Assembly symmetry: C3
Homo-oligomer: 145 residues x 3
């Protein structure tokens, strides 16, 4: 089975065995979540979303439509994803940009990921980084201070 | 009418027709919100706050006392506002700094807005930007990496 | 007494007189919180956590295992802490890195604090800063744009 906290609003039935979803999470009906994930408190997970197995999503993360997370990915707290490069209120694009975070990659706390981004397998994104371009497999990327 | 999610704590009656306020939002009594706004999950909206019509506020946004949002504004997820330039615990200023986000402006995901800031009409703030000075109407501003 | 909002999940009994804990907070059993703290909405507070007296924690803050906050500290909204320098999903270190935020220090909104960091007494961390090294007592530190 999976553990859905009574204080979460989980509307998806597509949740793998051993997955925990914690307090004050919202998960919309079409979200797919694999086995042995940890979805920590205060996350939002939209409809057009696929999350693999053994994925850690720390508190305060929103996963928008068009975002895929592969197996064994770590997403740090307050990591921010985007799917609309030039957002204007009530101006809905035909297609949202797709982001993919590839197997085993890690995104540091409070990093910001621009639309249409690929983060390669086993990459490491520094805490607080702004990711405006694809990060290659196994690369450590951070924003200079 | 307006839609207030049963899992929100909305204490304001000042909410325009067609406005949606989603799960785990807090809205204090004196907040004014216009028509056809979307206040996504996990937002906080204080008392001395005015939000216009057709405003999109994505997840994880707090709008403090002294902040005005004009019509047609887009606020990206996890955008952070401030109203106290030199904060010390339990040291309350006589007046909070005022921020105004002007008609049609857009603030990218996880941007940070310093106190007393004006963001001009139709401006575009890059995701993850730190805004330490006013942004002119129609200007695209982002922090260099 | 202390005020625990009915919409918070506070599991700790170790909460000082005059402390307020607001909506959609999670506080795990072993957390220690002093007197006259304000824990604003949408915070997460883990087990191996000590918070002193008169501490302000604004919305959207997570305090992980290994983090101590001394008296009179101000933590801005959406400040992000970390306790694992090279995070990989399901790879648990023997010891989490310890962070200490020393008496009277202030951390600006949406700042990011790397693991093992000391922020000295009465320091001021700029909004949106990335803190990769200890900040000395009474120093104002911010990330250049
Ligand atoms: C990116 C990271 C892996 C760097 O590790 P590293 O390659 O060992 O880097 P170092 O610690 O040797 O630092 C090298 C330099 O980059 C800087 N730097 C390190 N991490 C940085 C970051 N995230 N942003 C900006 N600069 C950073 C250091 O200040 C140092 O600068 P210097 O050479 O001028 O002294 C690490 O700092 C990090 O960000 N880890 C993620 C932590 C996290 O978010 N955990 C998840 C929540 S628990
Ligand atoms: C700011 C923004 C509009 C820039 O669009 P643009 O003017 O087309 O910019 P470009 O994509 O041409 O990039 C120009 C340069 O600025 C950099 N850049 C772009 N956006 C940046 C940002 N937010 N922060 C830092 N650098 C940024 C690019 O890396 C590029 O650098 P280069 O010239 O060295 O290659 C866009 O990148 C952005 O941030 N959009 C907001 C996304 C968002 O938050 N959506 C809301 C949630 S869905
Ligand atoms: C860091 C801070 C205290 C700086 O105050 P200060 O020392 O008076 O700095 P100034 O306003 O004189 O700015 C000096 C320069 O640093 C820049 N700067 C200021 N704060 C900055 C920040 N947080 N990040 C990056 N640059 C910053 C300014 O743009 C200015 O650049 P310039 O010299 O090129 O014009 C203040 O800007 C700040 O970040 N306050 C925290 C606000 C907050 O988070 N409040 C909590 C929530 S209410
Ligand atoms: C009991 C409880 C837990 N949680 C979440 C938030 C908390 O940190 C986490 C603990 O589960 P875990 O499996 O021990 O930890 P997790 O894998 O998420 O993260 C930990 O390990 C990794 C490797 C570190 O990088 C990370 N910084 C740690 O927090 O689960 C909640 O969100 N609510 C809860 O009530
Ligand atoms: C069903 C549901 C929705 N929401 C919020 C969060 C979700 O993304 C949003 C969907 O409503 P929308 O009107 O389709 O989308 P919105 O206008 O907010 O944003 C979308 O369109 C803009 C133009 C894009 O830039 C943006 N990135 C998109 O998310 O409403 C919640 O917070 N909880 C919910 O249960
Ligand atoms: C009524 C209510 C309040 N709160 C929190 C969030 C809100 O901003 C705060 C008000 O309490 P306060 O003691 O007046 O304010 P606080 O000390 O936290 O912060 C204020 O003063 C400091 C000095 C400023 O730097 C800061 N920017 C201010 O918000 O308490 C909630 O989280 N939920 C609530 O329902
Ligand atoms: Na943030």
């Amino acid at each position: 089975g999976h553990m859905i906290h009574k204080l979460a609003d989980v509307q998806s039935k597509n949740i793998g065995s051993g997955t925990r979803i914690w307090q004050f999470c919202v998960v919309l009906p079409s979200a797919i979540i694999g086995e042995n994930c940890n979805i920590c408190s205060h996350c939002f997970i939209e409809n057009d979303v696929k999350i693999g197995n053994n994925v850690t999503i720390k508190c305060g993360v929103q996963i928008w439509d068009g975002i895929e997370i592969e197996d064994d990915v770590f997403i740090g707290p307050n990591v921010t994803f985007t799917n609309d490069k030039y957002p204007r209120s009530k101006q809905y694009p035909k297609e949202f940009s797709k982001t993919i975070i590839k197997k085993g990659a890690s995104i540091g706390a409070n990093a910001t990921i621009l639309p249409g981004i690929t983060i390669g397998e086993n990459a490491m994104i520094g805490a607080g980084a702004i990711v405006t371009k694809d990060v290659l497999p196994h690369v450590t990327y951070y924003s200079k201070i």
